[PDB]
Symmetry: D3
Subunit: 150 residues, 6 copies
């Protein structure tokens, strides 16, 4: 399948040097990287990233942090890559994260949870369009596509 998910390294992940590890885990799974960019999100951008929230919202902080510095944003392609991406990442809240997952291994606070994954197929479609220009998605074939899948 050519299903795609959007994966970001939040600025706390870039700050504590987890960009490479994160990409590597997706690469090791057999998912394919079709878009990669480092950019510091707008306040505007950050606001739409969160679009929910809330009572307590703040919120305003989760916007401040998210545009505090660089994120590495990604597009990953493969069968069940949206689902499978979420599993790779772990529970949103690191305290509820399984060990051997990104948050499971490398994160404590839900408020500093290292990375982002789309939760649904449509959520990814929206998200990729938002972060990446069509021309920044590279269409290519893995020499290994027939060893991962049939």
């Amino acid at each position: 399948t050519s299903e795609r998910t959007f994966i970001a390294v939040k600025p706390d992940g870039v700050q504590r040097c987890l960009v490479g590890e994160i990409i590597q885990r997706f690469e090791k799974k057999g998912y394919k990287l079709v878009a990669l960019k480092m950019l510091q999100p707008s306040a505007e951008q950050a606001q739409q990233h969160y679009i929910d929230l809330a009572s307590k919202p703040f919120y305003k902080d989760l916007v401040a942090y998210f545009s505090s510095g660089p994120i590495v944003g990604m597009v990953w392609e493969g069968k069940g890559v949206v689902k499978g991406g979420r599993v790779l990442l772990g529970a949103t809240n690191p305290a509820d994260s399984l060990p051997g997952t990104i948050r499971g291994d490398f994160a404590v606070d839900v408020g500093r949870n290292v990375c982002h994954g789309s939760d649904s197929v449509d959520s990814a479609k929206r998200e990729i369009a938002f972060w990446f220009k069509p021309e920044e998605l590279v269409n290519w074939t893995s020499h290994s596509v027939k060893q991962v899948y049939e």
Copy 2:
């Protein structure tokens, strides 16, 4: 002590360079490697659509025999759930595989099946009897 399991890296694990990574995970767990062969399976050896004979015998595999307490289940825990979609991160199929069709390794379902599977793949001879210098650190 002294239960033995059979593990194999399928052609897709061997192609994708996961032989060291699988072996290493078994070694650090404290299990003892007892037999090791790279071979290309031949047509017949397909055990029970009906691709998986073009596939399972299209390229070399690494067969292995491992030894230790709970090694049937523990081994299969190590590989994780047969279906990569069900496999969890930290496990071989969880970390490395996507498709049931291309699930990298294999692990014997019962103590029973293990010995059928060892016998099938190995002469009782290719099978090395040694004692780990760590046996006393890993076990009581």
Copy 3:
């Protein structure tokens, strides 16, 4: 918080060269190493028991092993470090332990399960005091704390 826990690398764990490995999983989750030392337990040091304690199936030689070579004792600090600490160690019984955890990855036998972590905030407080002069113990601020927590 700020909550502290007690982690020990058991003699089999030291013997099997898992000290760096263990330390590193905690450093990498974001927990903070607040005290650390190698020692050989004395036999009444040994546990002491008083966990069980009511000694109990066959203490005699569980307390003989725990005292038979060196262990590495450590105190890590952070939110839920007590609970999360146990998570990294994995299920007390190696056979229940998930791959991705210290015991899951490295341990086969309960009698030789590499490590111990305090079982509650309360057990910790005690074990920390029993193992550590209250001053072998460093108060420092991680340059990463703002990145690990909001």
Copy 4:
């Protein structure tokens, strides 16, 4: 000294052979700072510029075909001697001469599939960086670890 920038690309073999995370993580953990990062397929014009040098075939039209036959990952890194240090991290250009521990030392066999490139000087770095990235793709930020890494 510390704001020095260098250009590092994982080449199309490296992307294919799934070594993007491997290489990036070697840089992050040396203490260097990721200042830009993207994925692109080089265009034939981008590919010819990369290898102007040789033209002068040798494997010109070949190298150009290869380098623009799939995605590469470009990056800009920043740190003290990051230009010199990057290349040390990547290993000697000819993999046959590179030492284990280095990217090419660990994962590469023949020079025409040497997995990556790094800028060879302050002045070639600055050029390549200017070449591959619009200046608004260079993110300007401070590592919370910069004082741990430098005096």
Copy 5:
């Protein structure tokens, strides 16, 4: 590219749980594994394996020991490979090995130097012929061969 070497994990490496690690290093390099087996050398085989002695009674010691328990034996194929393999191993003498190499990372003592690789293409084929029956030797094509070479 056709050129093949013999690589052996000596009994210390097998004992010290270094078999997967060594294999991994050759897979990651791009070399192809065209044969593999575990066996316990006889004194005869260990005696042959050593050109060597002649002695200083470290022969005999080498000869025992080497037949002390199982070795893991391998044949690797890549644009040779014999040289490149030895480079992955590190200087035969561990005191001279650099970090990054197998012996660099794991060996201290020449008598326990973990592993072996043939010193020449001709030496290689003796060793391959000596250790392997010509049909224990799968000819196959790595799906990556075109990414590791031109």
Copy 6:
């Protein structure tokens, strides 16, 4: 023969940059034996003394300040050649020189912040072990793998 003992310290930059585990783990994997291990915060005197063949330098005041600025992790490792081996694992004292594969090679950029320390001689080690530790903190044990590492 030996046996033989050296002193390895993770500098406070190394502790800060979460590399205690990684460093210990290299010594373990190498066959060396860890016979003492504690974390402590160096006092100005201890700091001042460590940077002794260095007391008449521009940096020093800053090095002392830094070394006592927060916790270090001190170790005593035992095994044949360990003083020289321990430093090879560590890599050239100045990062710009150290090779990938080594601790400073993989993880450090500048001398001020070079992460770790190993005694330079058999004698230095013995000064440093006696200084940083007390005999009773120095365990005496035998590794089950000792026979596998040494012939």
